Design a protein around this ligand. Sequence first.
Ligand SMILES: CCCCC/C=C/C/C=C\C/C=C\C/C=C\CCCC(=O)O[C@H](COC(=O)CCCCCCCCCCCCCCCCC)COP(=O)(O)O[C@@H]1[C@H](O)[C@@H](O)[C@H](OP(=O)(O)O)[C@@H](O)[C@H]1O
Ligand SMILES: *[C@@H]1O[C@H](CO)[C@@H](O[C@@H]2O[C@H](CO)[C@@H](O[C@@H]3O[C@H](CO)[C@@H](O)[C@H](O[C@@H]4O[C@H](CO)[C@@H](O)[C@H](O)[C@@H]4O)[C@@H]3O)[C@H](O)[C@H]2NC(C)=O)[C@H](O)[C@H]1NC(C)=O
Ligand SMILES: *[C@@H]1O[C@H](CO)[C@@H](O[C@@H]2O[C@H](CO)[C@@H](O)[C@H](O)[C@H]2NC(C)=O)[C@H](O)[C@H]1NC(C)=O
Ligand SMILES: *[C@@H]1O[C@H](CO)[C@@H](O[C@@H]2O[C@H](CO)[C@@H](O)[C@H](O)[C@H]2NC(C)=O)[C@H](O)[C@H]1NC(C)=O
Ligand SMILES: *[C@@H]1O[C@H](CO)[C@@H](O)[C@H](O)[C@H]1NC(C)=O
Ligand SMILES: [Mg+2]
Lengths: 350, 1064
Amino acid sequence: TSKKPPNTAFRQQRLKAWQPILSPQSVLPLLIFVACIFTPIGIGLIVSATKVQDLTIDYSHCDTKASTTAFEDIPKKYIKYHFKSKVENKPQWRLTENENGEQSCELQFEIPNDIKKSIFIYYKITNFYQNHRRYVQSFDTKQILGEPIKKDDLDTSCSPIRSREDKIIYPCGLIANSMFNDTFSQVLSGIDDTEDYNLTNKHISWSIDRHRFKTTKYNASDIVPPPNWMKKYPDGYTDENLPDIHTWEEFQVWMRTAAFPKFYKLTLKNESASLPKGKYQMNIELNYPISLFGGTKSFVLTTNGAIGGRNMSLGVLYLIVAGLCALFGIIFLVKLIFQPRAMGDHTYLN
Amino acid sequence: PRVIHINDSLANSSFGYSDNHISTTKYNFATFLPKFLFQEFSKYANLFFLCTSAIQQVPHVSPTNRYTTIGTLLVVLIVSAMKECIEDIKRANSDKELNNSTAEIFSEAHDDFVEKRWIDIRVGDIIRVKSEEPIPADTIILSSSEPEGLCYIETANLDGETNLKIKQSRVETAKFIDVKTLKNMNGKVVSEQPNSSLYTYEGTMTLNDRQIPLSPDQMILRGATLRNTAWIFGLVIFTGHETKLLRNATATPIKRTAVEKIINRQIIALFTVLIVLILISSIGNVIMSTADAKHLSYLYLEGTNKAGLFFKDFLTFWILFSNLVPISLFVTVELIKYYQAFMIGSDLDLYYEKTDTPTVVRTSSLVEELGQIEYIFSDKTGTLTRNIMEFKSCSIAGHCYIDKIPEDKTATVEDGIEVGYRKFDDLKKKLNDPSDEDSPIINDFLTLLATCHTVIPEFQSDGSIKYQAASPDEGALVQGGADLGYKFIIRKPNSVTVLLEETGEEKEYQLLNICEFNSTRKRMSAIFRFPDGSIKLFCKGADTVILERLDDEANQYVEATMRHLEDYASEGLRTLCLAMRDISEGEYEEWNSIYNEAATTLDNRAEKLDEAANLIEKNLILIGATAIEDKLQDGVPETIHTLQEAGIKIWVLTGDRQETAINIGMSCRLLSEDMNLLIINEETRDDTERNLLEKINALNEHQLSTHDMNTLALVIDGKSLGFALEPELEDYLLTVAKLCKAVICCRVSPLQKALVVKMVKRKSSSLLLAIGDGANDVSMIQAAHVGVGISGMEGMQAARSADIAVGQFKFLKKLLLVHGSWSYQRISVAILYSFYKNTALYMTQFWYVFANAFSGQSIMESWTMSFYNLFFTVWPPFVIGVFDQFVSSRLLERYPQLYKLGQKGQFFSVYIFWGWIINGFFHSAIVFIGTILIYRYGFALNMHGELADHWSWGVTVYTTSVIIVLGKAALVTNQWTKFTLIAIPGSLLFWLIFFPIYASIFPHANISREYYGVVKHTYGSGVFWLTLIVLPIFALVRDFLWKYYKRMYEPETYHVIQEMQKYN
Ligand SMILES: CCCCC/C=C/C/C=C\C/C=C\C/C=C\CCCC(=O)O[C@H](COC(=O)CCCCCCCCCCCCCCCCC)COP(=O)(O)O[C@@H]1[C@H](O)[C@@H](O)[C@H](OP(=O)(O)O)[C@@H](O)[C@H]1O
Ligand SMILES: *[C@@H]1O[C@H](CO)[C@@H](O[C@@H]2O[C@H](CO)[C@@H](O[C@@H]3O[C@H](CO)[C@@H](O)[C@H](O[C@@H]4O[C@H](CO)[C@@H](O)[C@H](O)[C@@H]4O)[C@@H]3O)[C@H](O)[C@H]2NC(C)=O)[C@H](O)[C@H]1NC(C)=O
Ligand SMILES: *[C@@H]1O[C@H](CO)[C@@H](O[C@@H]2O[C@H](CO)[C@@H](O)[C@H](O)[C@H]2NC(C)=O)[C@H](O)[C@H]1NC(C)=O
Ligand SMILES: *[C@@H]1O[C@H](CO)[C@@H](O[C@@H]2O[C@H](CO)[C@@H](O)[C@H](O)[C@H]2NC(C)=O)[C@H](O)[C@H]1NC(C)=O
Ligand SMILES: *[C@@H]1O[C@H](CO)[C@@H](O)[C@H](O)[C@H]1NC(C)=O
Ligand SMILES: [Mg+2]
């Protein structure tokens, strides 16, 4: 019956609230506080990123510009290194070949400082667009779980490499077919009274990848290798040639599509002992040609820090924010000191 | 030809006529989709996203899931559908409440009147219509309680005339009063086909003996209202949509605001920039895929069909960028407007107590215009006045008597003839004793006040007698003449009884004949016979018509009456002169014969009866004059001054003459004592042209000073306005009216009240507000941009057709200053921000085509992007568009000039839309470069040397984007209530809690398999909780410092008003 609206703090738009004012006495302390809390964080982050000791060797073109009879020096254009001390001997490299053109690049470097942190070894690839749309979605996730999917039920996303010669290609996709296949030494062969340094090859991928990549339930007379794996698996698949994507951890590491054409991929690691100083040697079986993607392969030996490893983006961001805050907290201060606003009155601006 | 039976409900039903059910619903449960889908896809964004979803169904083209956009499309579609259904149910509620009323219908079997509903009313049934109830349908009258068969109908709903029409029944069939005699009557009624003409009717009724013709003189429409009649017997002919009034129903045209057109322009701009980005990306893609055909051999490109690979690439970016045009906005804006209309139509300061009528915003699509009004086309009778008459003063025998004597001129100076103000006590003290000469004249006047009228008396159980008059002025005259002792009581036909409270005895006079009122003569005569044997004729009229036929040698108070009319007309009081004359029997018989000769000629009534009554009106003895006031509503002189101070021009359409309108405008504080009046009152069109030319040249020949431009007003009558609305002279009137601050139109014709509005909006860009009451100006309310209807005594015809329904005028000071400046500052920020939070996200989809070789790779997940527009960024817009107040209402009424800030358009434009867009671009680039500088090779983790990837980086991008969007929202808001804490930090915590649960549960159901193990590598990583701290501050320091600078060293008006509000 009655049409009178209620009298409450909500229906009458009378809710209690707070009015944020930007007085200088409430802004300048905020800026100086932000500066005083972002300077120590920034210097701590740059100190943490400074203590990372790493090494990188561009072993691309080793089959063309590296000697064969002796260990010649590596051009300074290729090598990079950051250590806590000075390196006395420049890294060198040599080429070797065995039977059927099995080329190999032998690098020799010198670790002048006892690295107490755990050692990691990656291969760095450049100009490889894994983030390509046609390339990132081209892999069947059911076969990764290990199931005998028929031909007419395969994922149509891996279309160019699907059912060759009327047989279900087992690793359907462009990510598996284009796998990086340069085998590493799995040990830093010490030279001149320096003991070796074994490296672990397992537990390098993601736990969920080890849990989802299951051993295949396929046979061997109804599947064919991808066109790029026919060199290692000739005459097709057999009962023994058939791999297992569960234990094959490098396959799982490669199947993690990266975001940028400059990416690392974990290959080896060692977290059980310190790496002493001395001369070490690493062998790489050159199988992957750089002419396929026009990039530059690299062997990287790094450690880990609180942020990652030799990267000062976060520290410089913190320092830039602190510097801008401390600069404006002086600009506005001297501006209000030398010439106040003198316009607090309304003066009937209407 | 329509043949209708008289008392056969089953015989006439074979023709299959319409039902009496009146339906006003928009949708129904039978054909809801075939029209709702068309209405929803008749727009731009809906059809665009439908085409996008249709394109997204081709293979190897969609960069995201196939159902990532059609889901949001169906969500917004069902939201729109449920809102349409809610409003349609709210309409159907009142529709069914009005359509199920009771009706007394005759029964063939029962042979009596039974109560039924309007739904079951069929054509051909006999009904009994009682008093003070609306007409059910188009019924022909059979009989009535009156002996002759006449009744009174009021056209307050079907037309604009307030007078009562007398509809008489056929004398050959009005003898059926009882029900038991209604069974022996047979026949058929041949009526015309359903049309829309009102006063044209033709038919033929078959009676028991002979057939009779039909005419609109015995036909009552549905929109009429019966009055002063006990009961009528009606036979229905037209029902439902087959009537004469409800057949050609009017449809209110959708009013498009300026904000809508600015939104359309911004949408076109977004579409253009979308096409630009798509074309740039496609060209880059094709040139990179053609120039590097050797370094991309591991992708197994087509080659021979690369041309086709161009087209399939184009679409690939379209979808990827289709999120640049937000579809959630077209529903968020209307929901915000709905909530604002609800919160406005529920305020106490806009609620009327003496009538129980709150503000009812009938159209919630016009809420933001209240903050940008420049013209107000107002009414006077009803909108400015209380529309209730009150007997104020009387002047007889050359004296003046009022109840409230003001101290300005109470002491009569006696400068020759007596001039001044006296009380009614002196009138009684000079009337009681018969020794005074004017006492018989006072008796004649006090009897004329209670005898010459045509008011119907009604007695009640309480004893208070009620008066029913066709006009309020006659009722006020009767009330002012009755309260002193000469009351008007029971009036039997052909005589008038007057109760004398001074003596205690009731007298009675024989009313011989009365003449009807005329608009041209503006007079009314009535002859009476007294028990003393004298025949006396009374005559009432205007001040400029009857005074010309007086006897200057008989009356000695002519100049006194002229002065009493002049000083009363100077205050806006309606004046009426009363005169009398004694006649003999011979001239009385001659006048009776002339009246009979005039009544025998039914062809001429307007001129014949007037000339017959004026045949004896050759000389009269003037008794005196009466003056009735009509006060203004409370607060109008303050609200009008406050609106003028805010910078709004008012055009008062007054029905009075020049001087009366000028005086009531000066009393209403519309004008002033120094406002130069540009009077334009001329009959010759050429003279009006010359006057307009003189005005415009005298105005343009010199500069307009600040004091001279602010102090100008215009006054124009009815004929001058009708001559100044021609297509050849309208420009002069418009350019002379755009300079003055207040316009006053006098003697305005009803329909012309619309032509003054439809002439401005077609030749200007300002927004109009037409406030009025009654039906006579309803066409005005449907003509301006914002229509306002007052609830008054003229009927509810204007409130049911206005965009806003307000109880009185005083509320406008708060409806426009507070509920406008807010309603324009909110929605604007609720739209610009709606374009920012989108650009701050999906623009990272464009800066990424430089890293994925121009392929079109989604940086983020397919469903998280779809949930960005539904769950995490949908409440800050509502909070800033419904609950935000940039300035308090206590200071928004003290300084009305702030209204100008919304009157020009300083809060919503394309120049600010582009600023918001480029700010979004800047923030997107900031977050993109900051994320790619940290995830350089993915080697930014500390968990046993494991590396991040694509999705573990897209998640950080999305999180930083939403954090910066919420920080911008927090920087924009002014009112920190509780809904703000629920909207901004509430949404932040909602995302922070929803991401782990989703990414841990849903991947196991084949919904988002790209989130396996990302929760650990995101949350457990020590760099996530550092970039989330270092990037939003780095991106919002610019906005913070710019806000501080603009507030401190380059303020505005409200920037100082907010400081005064904070510190005082
Ligand atoms: C390592 C180097 C670090 C450099 C760091 C530099 C930071 C600052 C950079 C530039 C700023 C330059 C000068 C800063 C000084 C003044 C800026 C003036 C800004 C300006 O008036 O218009 C603004 C737009 O603002 C941009 O749209 C801002 C425009 C910025 C766009 C820049 C051009 C595009 C950049 C794209 C780069 C992409 C490159 C590609 C990289 C990726 C490629 C892969 C307007 O919007 P607004 O929200 O403020 O509007 C205000 C505001 O709402 C409120 O503060 C006001 O009330 P009150 O104040 O009374 O409370 C109110 O009245 C209203 O007026
Ligand atoms: C490490 O990874 C390298 C890059 O993926 C890979 O190098 C490629 O290996 C494939 C496999 O042999 C090569 O593809 C063959 O090339 C030869 C010419 O050299 C073609 O004749 C051959 O086509 C043949 O066609 C026959 C008839 O259709 C068919 O019966 C044969 O089975 C065969 O398919 C292939 O096209 C490719 O050229 C190599 N280079 C590049 C740049 O791709 C290494 O083999 C791999 N090494 C190991 C040890 O896994
Ligand atoms: C990590 O490196 C250390 C250092 O070489 C390895 O420890 C050696 O393991 C070999 C096993 O063949 C032993 O013969 C050596 O005596 C160990 N060194 C010392 C100082 O005790 C360790 O095995 C490596 N971790 C792996 C391979 O997982
Ligand atoms: C630890 O390092 C030693 C030194 O290289 C590894 O011993 C070699 O093992 C390979 C694999 O069978 C042989 O071909 C070499 O002849 C071995 N060399 C020597 C000097 O023994 C040893 O295998 C490593 N530990 C593990 C667990 O692999
Ligand atoms: C493997 O064995 C034969 C073909 O070698 C076939 O009948 C069978 O279905 C294959 N798959 C499994 C799971 O046994
Ligand atoms: Mg009115």
